[PDB]
Design a protein around this motif. Sequence first.
Motif: not given
Lengths: 157, 157, 153
Positions: C89-93
């Motif tokens: 989702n266009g996010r790094f975690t």
Amino acid sequence: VMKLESDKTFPIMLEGKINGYACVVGGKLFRPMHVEGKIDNDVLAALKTKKASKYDLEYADVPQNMRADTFKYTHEKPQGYYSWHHGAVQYENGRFTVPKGVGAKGDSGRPILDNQGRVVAIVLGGVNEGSRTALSVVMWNEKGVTVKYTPENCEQW
Amino acid sequence: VMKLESDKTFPIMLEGKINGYACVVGGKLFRPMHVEGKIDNDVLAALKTKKASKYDLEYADVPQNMRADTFKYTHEKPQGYYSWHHGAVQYENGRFTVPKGVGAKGDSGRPILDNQGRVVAIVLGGVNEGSRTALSVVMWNEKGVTVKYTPENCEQW
Amino acid sequence: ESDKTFPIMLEGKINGYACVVGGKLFRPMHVEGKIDNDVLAALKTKKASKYDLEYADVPQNMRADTFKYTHEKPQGYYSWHHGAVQYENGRFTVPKGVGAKGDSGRPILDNQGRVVAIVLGGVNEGSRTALSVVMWNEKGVTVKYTPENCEQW
């Protein structure tokens, strides 16, 4: 090829406070004349500046290595909106305006830009006129002639 | 194409050609009386001029919106060199000279400036005297009094 | 090879990191201190405030010995100095309890060892911690993503 656009505006420090801004447009460096202080950038701060009282602007040619990293400018000012640090900037009937309560001493020298990232004007100050605040600016017509416009009862920023 | 400096000399047209020049100095517009034609600037072309035959000069106060952007003048004329549209102008023994082949009809009204950008004289004409050509001009002395000098056998340009 | 990211020393501690990616030197703008390498530490940087970065073009006799980056961020696993990183989702975690002050500047790499983002900060959101980064799209355009209430590292 990584194209990362770098800052093209720089705070002018005075008594350890941001008293305004300078910027680089078209290989030149500009700073509102009425604004005192030292540009928070050694290289630029050393440049000698020519003065143009008529436009409340001082300017100098930027170093060779910076010639390619400055703002492009345009005279094209179709009525509509533009941006500057604080947000939306409107242009209609020859005047740039911003929302009431936005803009105050310290913003002098900030550029205004179109959606193509091109500079259409440089802010010198402003004044509230009801729901909007009208700006004093330096702009350019098709011939490249610099024009300065200052609203009634304007306040230098 | 950014233009930060305003023009201070304007060509005078006559039958499509440049017949001479007018220039703004000390808040006033000057034009050689012997030169006929229309100044190529509507605002200046409309100003009513005061005549002074003795000096072959016509003049009028410049509208305030331009008063600030006009040449600065001086009476200081130490022997040495100055400049004008065509190049180096020498000043010695109370007279200005330029190299042979430079200066002709159409040059009347052009100013001669010192290195500080101040106007020391206005050209009215000249005459070749060999390797050099002597100029006819109107200068200013201590008292700010206009003085006109014309070489022997001079001819109006 | 092997040394492409260097610690940024301040008062003796590591306040963060700097790395060379695509012929360019990168260093978080909010991180103060001197790069642990005279060569990089000696280069003059330009500010890129919109991205909270400061960079400089590395010399020519070095452009080939720096990280290679990519815009390709297909949903999946990635890595960095602290372990596994997930992109979705266009996010790094990262897992909870991982990452903190001193990590700003660390790069995230794909299975091919290519940089896909530089860490700027992060904010815990339950079992996962969302990272604020600087990355690139399919056009070589540098982008900055910052989760809500993201604390700088």
